[PDB]
Design a protein around this ligand. Sequence first.
Ligand SMILES: Cc1cn([C@H]2C[C@H](OP(=O)(O)O)[C@@H](COP(=O)(O)O)O2)c(=O)[nH]c1=O
Ligand SMILES: [Ca+2]
Length: 130
Amino acid sequence: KLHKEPATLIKAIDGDTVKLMYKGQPMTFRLLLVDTPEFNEKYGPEASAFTKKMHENAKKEEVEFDKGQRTDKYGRGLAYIYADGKMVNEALVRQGLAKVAYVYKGNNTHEQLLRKAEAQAKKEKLNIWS
Ligand SMILES: Cc1cn([C@H]2C[C@H](OP(=O)(O)O)[C@@H](COP(=O)(O)O)O2)c(=O)[nH]c1=O
Ligand SMILES: [Ca+2]
């Protein structure tokens, strides 16, 4: 029911935002359903590094919008972002580098997937959960 669409990296930003070219236009994307620590907070650097590596090493980046709001109040695109088929949002949670967060009704298709990842991260006492 959701669809992956093409994009190309313009620039890594931090754990939960990235600059991508989408339909030929530069956009800042904010990753749905997650919150990484800000760069100055604990695990912030590690979260940014993690996403910078995923995004930059990817051959193919893709954007998947949910069923709701596609842009937030700051004009950031709201999407699930995939790096060579692997969801960055979920990877962050699974590594304990983000919390599931900002779960608004109707842009929450992958909520349960991410919560499962968070439970596994917490069980493994990874990073934020250490
Ligand atoms: C993830 C997400 C954030 N936002 C807004 C809510 C928060 O508003 P406030 O700025 O007023 O706190 C902010 C959190 O983003 P950041 O975590 O990037 O700051 O982004 C949405 O509106 N929709 C979303 O899906
Ligand atoms: Ca954040």
